């Protein structure tokens, strides 16, 4: 059954069992849901109410523009013509950009700086706990993620409607995350997040004040396939969550990722610079003919 | 209570009462819901299933493009990033364009030609019934709508998600329709359509296999304010309709609209060409300075 | 012949003749070209080189994105597929926004603050010179433009290619400017700006280090038709200017514009709040039915 | 010096020398310019005048929309705000779509059907001439391009302004064409097309009534590197061409491309299905993690 982990229990006598759940989650699920994670409910509830406030502003503004755009063509804009989807990204590390993102309150910007510093601390704690389970030095993964300027840490803030009906959302393509460790905060209890475990869809159980954690492709490389990045997809439920803060703690652009030499005995995962993996992901690496001829010879 | 009108009863002994409901609806509601309207359930159910099929194709295509667009920026497209709103228009009269609209099946195009001819016949029947209640010649409104080339008749086909939550949709601007007579076919029974009667929102009652009819600004002019066009808005409900075919039967561009001289005794509504009203609606009429100076002198 | 005015000559013995040219320009041309205007060539040449630098960055960035967008569809982006047009606005008064506009250098932002303060001083000087020619109190127009928070002052920065060929640009719609006083700085000497004087197109003569000034609709109201806002259009020449900084000094949103009572003897121009004129200009004023019925009755 | 080839001379006594020029062009230039190519000047001049007519319609329409869009925001659209770039594609083989492309005259559609049939005949002639020079069977390349349904043949029609200045266009990325054989028809004599021969830019010489031909990546594979696809880019000149019809004759999606076994003695170019090469080109092939791990191991 799905790993739900009370993170505070790692401080007390039930540490061995809690670290075991994390080990089990990392090896067999690629995902776990955290509660009692050292981020107050007051802080999370602030983030929710404020983000929903910003969203409400954007939709009232968007409708005024739609009515004007549509009226230009001699057509009445209905409320049913609304694009309810809104998403924007907030970079934190190595260079923050919360001061430069358009159309935010100063008190909103300040709470997201507070939210980001809290999350990188949680992210870095979890990586240390992983380091311990793997039998590795403290801060090995933080070190490996660093590169020169430091690790890439940012947050995708999204607000969205429910899906019109399930059968449309069926047959949609899933993915594994290319990054390092990914921390999802949502409103409600129902995430609408599904894992593809043994050919079948398992829903992430609903939990209030939770943070859902999962491991990306980079940690699979570093652990030499031991902690695998798992196939998944998020879908908006009819009476579930309609707000998602997805914070990605990835390696820095120039960080050289490779399997930790300790975790290699008797195939071997590759060595590469993180930006090149992301450049492959975005289709930039085969923009000339000679590379394409290499690739077609390999196949 | 809201006028629900069985149109077949106009053929039988209960005609007087049915015409009375239409008169009451036209004068005090500006809206009525038709059942038994001479369009088979089989024909409507075909239109629904086929349109939803086309919509499903567009969303699977749209997601493939989104995943590719987002991957270009080194970002994973989630299903929650989907724009579920899709809308396109089908002109019928005076010049049909169902053959030229991109990405439709031939069997779909053919059903919409069949659907359009059925609706203009219903539209023109209703106008005659209105002519009778007003004490006017048969086909007076059809005549008045004609102009030179004939009346404008088309259909807005829309598919959309539910609204994330009510409080966002609250405070949204309502309208009266600028056109002639407007016929709304929907799936489900719940329209999500609201009238603004005496300062308060009244929902259009849910009815299966119904066509909701309402009168636009042009009929108010022609009736000299007797049949007023009513304030309204449509909002997508959480478990209501998610498909809307809104067919507008408006006057032709060059049609001269004015109050029928019979309906004038002891202020008088204006005379104008329909295209000029629509050019005013779209803000094209005050594109030069001299017109603006006229308007500011009037205020 | 077109009014070219050396502004420094207003300090010396040739003031009467220079003020006469301004009077003539304001009454019979609606336009004049300033030289020796109290903005150093060094300051203007800085603005040019820096803005062209920012533009070059945007086009290299835009092409990288186009190549990626087009490659997504299995198509090679040619250089001939480039959208060379780029335009952005910089608000100065009442609230500056040069700090918040994306993708600018700090040294660029700082020069535009310096450029803006210089131009509002020039703008306000010219309005005083107009006040003198009209026989009005010093700062009357600045006062009238103020409202509550102060006048609207901003700058449209544009970079663009030449027009493919003249015959495409022929038959294009001209305008008068809705605002107050409009100050155009360009690179090159050839503006590509044309006036519509007595039914015929007159080119603004080419002059290096010039600022082209023209009067908008608001000054025509305030002068009771004496200083008329003139029809014009700007067109990119094959070997002329390819950069335009158009700074608009308009009245504040809440400023009540009306003909100065001194300038009224034996029709009278209207009184209105500036925002309402701009709301009429944008087609927002006839978004409901009752207003439209007023307008159609007037016609 | 650049290969300019009179194609009619292949019928007469000067055939050996003309075929030698084609061999030289194919081996050392990857490009040649055809004259007297069996497409009348009357037919080409029709294509030019008609396409420019369609373009003029689109720009007058685009400006009307821009003026309305910009006026919505309380801003005057200048002619200098125009996006002059317009481009659309016309599929011919295996399935024509000239009947379905929006906003074309019937007489325009018909001329493009006539133009397409002429070009595929020219394309297939040239491939036979190449087959002869390579020492291959007649129609070997046409056969190899076929797959199941037949070869992909279409035409990119583009209209565009000149580049604002050269130094912006400098440092822009060049390419080789991924397709088969590519035939460029232009107005004017100046193409603005440049080859990257021995590290340096060579302009394609200006010639009236010419068709510029070049070889893509697929022909390099089939010839086992003998006929190489050459680096190039097209740039709009200040007083050169402003219209480009680029017709691509590529292999069919399912066509298996590989080096002709005759042309292999003592590295070997790869075998692949054409769609997979184009799927690699568009970045779709590394959308999952396992493929990316293969690619990073190879590097
Ligand atoms: Ni994910
Ligand atoms: Ni409506
Ligand atoms: Ni202007
Ligand atoms: Ni090319």
Coordinates of C-alpha atoms in Angstrom, one line a residue, chain B residues 65 68-69 72 173-178 217-218 220-221 228-230 268-273 276-278 280-283 285-293 295-299, chain C residues 65 68-69 72 173-178 217-218 220-221 228-230 268-273 276-278 280-283 285-293 295-299:
Chain B
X65 CA 1.3 19.9 -29.6
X68 CA 6.0 19.3 -27.9
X69 CA 5.8 23.1 -27.3
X72 CA 11.0 22.9 -26.4
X173 CA -20.7 40.8 -16.9
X174 CA -24.0 39.9 -18.5
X175 CA -25.4 40.9 -21.9
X176 CA -28.4 41.1 -24.1
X177 CA -28.0 39.5 -27.6
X178 CA -27.6 42.0 -30.4
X217 CA -32.1 43.5 -29.6
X218 CA -33.5 43.6 -33.2
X220 CA -37.1 44.7 -29.5
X221 CA -36.7 47.5 -32.1
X228 CA -37.6 43.2 -24.8
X229 CA -34.2 41.5 -25.2
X230 CA -33.3 40.2 -21.7
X268 CA -40.2 55.6 -30.6
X269 CA -37.3 53.1 -31.3
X270 CA -34.8 54.0 -34.0
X271 CA -34.4 53.0 -37.7
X272 CA -31.1 51.7 -39.0
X273 CA -29.3 49.2 -41.2
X276 CA -24.3 49.7 -38.7
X277 CA -25.7 48.4 -35.4
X278 CA -23.1 45.6 -35.5
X280 CA -21.3 50.2 -33.5
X281 CA -21.2 47.0 -31.3
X282 CA -17.6 46.3 -32.5
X283 CA -16.3 49.9 -31.9
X285 CA -18.1 53.6 -35.9
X286 CA -15.9 56.0 -33.8
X287 CA -12.6 55.4 -35.6
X288 CA -12.3 59.1 -36.7
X289 CA -12.3 62.3 -34.6
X290 CA -15.4 64.1 -35.9
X291 CA -17.8 61.2 -34.9
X292 CA -16.2 61.2 -31.4
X293 CA -16.9 65.0 -31.1
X295 CA -20.8 61.6 -29.4
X296 CA -19.2 63.8 -26.7
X297 CA -21.5 66.7 -27.5
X298 CA -24.5 64.4 -27.0
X299 CA -23.4 63.3 -23.6
Chain C
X65 CA 12.7 30.2 -30.9
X68 CA 12.7 25.4 -32.6
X69 CA 9.0 26.1 -33.2
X72 CA 8.7 20.9 -34.1
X173 CA -6.0 54.2 -43.5
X174 CA -4.7 57.4 -41.8
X175 CA -5.6 58.9 -38.4
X176 CA -5.4 61.9 -36.2
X177 CA -3.9 61.3 -32.7
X178 CA -6.4 61.1 -29.9
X217 CA -7.5 65.8 -30.6
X218 CA -7.4 67.1 -27.0
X220 CA -8.2 70.9 -30.8
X221 CA -10.9 70.7 -28.1
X228 CA -6.7 71.2 -35.4
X229 CA -5.3 67.7 -35.1
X230 CA -4.1 66.7 -38.6
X268 CA -18.6 75.0 -29.6
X269 CA -16.4 71.9 -28.9
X270 CA -17.6 69.5 -26.2
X271 CA -16.7 69.0 -22.5
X272 CA -15.7 65.5 -21.3
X273 CA -13.4 63.5 -19.0
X276 CA -14.3 58.6 -21.5
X277 CA -13.0 59.8 -24.9
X278 CA -10.4 57.0 -24.8
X280 CA -15.2 55.7 -26.8
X281 CA -12.0 55.3 -29.0
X282 CA -11.7 51.7 -27.8
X283 CA -15.4 50.7 -28.4
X285 CA -18.9 52.8 -24.4
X286 CA -21.5 50.9 -26.4
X287 CA -21.2 47.5 -24.7
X288 CA -24.9 47.6 -23.6
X289 CA -28.1 48.0 -25.6
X290 CA -29.6 51.2 -24.3
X291 CA -26.5 53.3 -25.3
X292 CA -26.7 51.8 -28.8
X293 CA -30.3 52.8 -29.1
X295 CA -26.6 56.4 -30.8
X296 CA -28.9 55.0 -33.6
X297 CA -31.6 57.6 -32.7
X298 CA -29.0 60.4 -33.2
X299 CA -28.0 59.1 -36.6

